[PDB]
Amino acid sequence: TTPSKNNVTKKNWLDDPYLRWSYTHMKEFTLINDVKNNPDQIARFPSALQNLDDFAVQRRFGSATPLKELLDDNKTDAFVVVHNGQLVYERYFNGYNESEPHGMASLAKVFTGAIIQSLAEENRIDLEKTADTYIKELKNTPFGKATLQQLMDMQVSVEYPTHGYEHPALENQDAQLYLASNILPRDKNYDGPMKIYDMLQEAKETAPPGSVFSYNNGSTETLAWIIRTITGKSLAENVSERIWSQIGMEENAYYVTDETKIEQASAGLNATARDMARFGQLLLNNGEYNGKQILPSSITEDIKNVQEGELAIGPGASISYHNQWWIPHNEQGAFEVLGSYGQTLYIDPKAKMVIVHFSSNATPSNEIHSVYSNMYIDIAHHLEKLPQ
């Protein structure tokens, strides 16, 4: 089957092979709000190209496989490597157009996080206040009772009804956001959320806020609701004014929305790979672009100061999470954001490297995430001209 607009449906868009189309053409399938660049202030990426096609990736010790073929075998669509602020390697696969925005799943979350941090530092919000301080509609509900900081750190434990929907490759927290946004099928008896905020109102608390890490789209969606309420502007307009128009982006981005034109803050941003790399470089540079503080320097500072055992993702976990970012505690001090179907923004401050990885891998193997995580370290050490 060759996927196309004529055969991709609300039922199947997340499944192979349909996903290879849907995640490269989301705006042809859904409602969107544009995130504008500045067309008069694009900044071409300086380059220092190295062909990594035959770079030996260790699937495991003693089993190497060449990089370009490994990427393709795992349904990668785009792969961009930036080193010391220069483009080193980019590859686009499966007919995917480098200049067309791609789905990025949870990579969106870091944009909401960044704007929350900016607003907090502008003294417009207080991260230690409860969400229902700002969203009166959420008063005394589980997302309402959480502090902004708890939301930022994914420490709000919530379950939603299923409304009878289940898909074998989808967590309920994702299914519900998509049902809320009208991009999964609502059956004859559907009694579930009709817009994103409805989902938040259905939240049932399963542990006290702050008590443990629990990854939930709803936390980011709540934070985005705060952005909109405080600023009186859409999330798309906020991201455009604060970020997308400010760092030489080549193309517009866009957010998938619900039927009320509320953006999926947690999962709906679509952008080009080089543009995501520009944002990566911004964070590598602690929020500075051509001498201007675009985003708070605290974002990266605070992340880099998270020690093993602080903000852990579970008891004894070596991985931490802070302000919408994962902190693996790898040998590079890297930090990253991940998204379903093989998306990654990965920042390595030791090697001064950014990797953007976009995919449309409907059901990734259990091994590929660790293969990639280790491959990023090996790429960095290669670019740094280290013996290993």
From TrEMBL:
Instruction: Write down the Gene3D superfamilies for this protein, in alphabetical order.
Output: DD-peptidase/beta-lactamase superfamily
Write out the entry's keywords from A to Z: Hydrolase
Domain of life of the organism encoding this protein? Bacteria
Beta-lactamase-related domain ranges (all copies): 77-364
Q: Which GO terms describe its molecular function?
A: hydrolase activity
Pfam families for this protein: Beta-lactamase
InterPro entries in alphabetical order: Beta-lactam-related, Beta-lactam/transpept-like, Diverse_Enzym_Activities
- Protein name per Swiss-Prot or TrEMBL: 6-aminohexanoate-dimer hydrolase
Q: Which organism is it from?
A: Bacillus anthracis
* Phylogenetic placement of the source organism: Bacteria, Bacillati, Bacillota, Bacilli, Bacillales
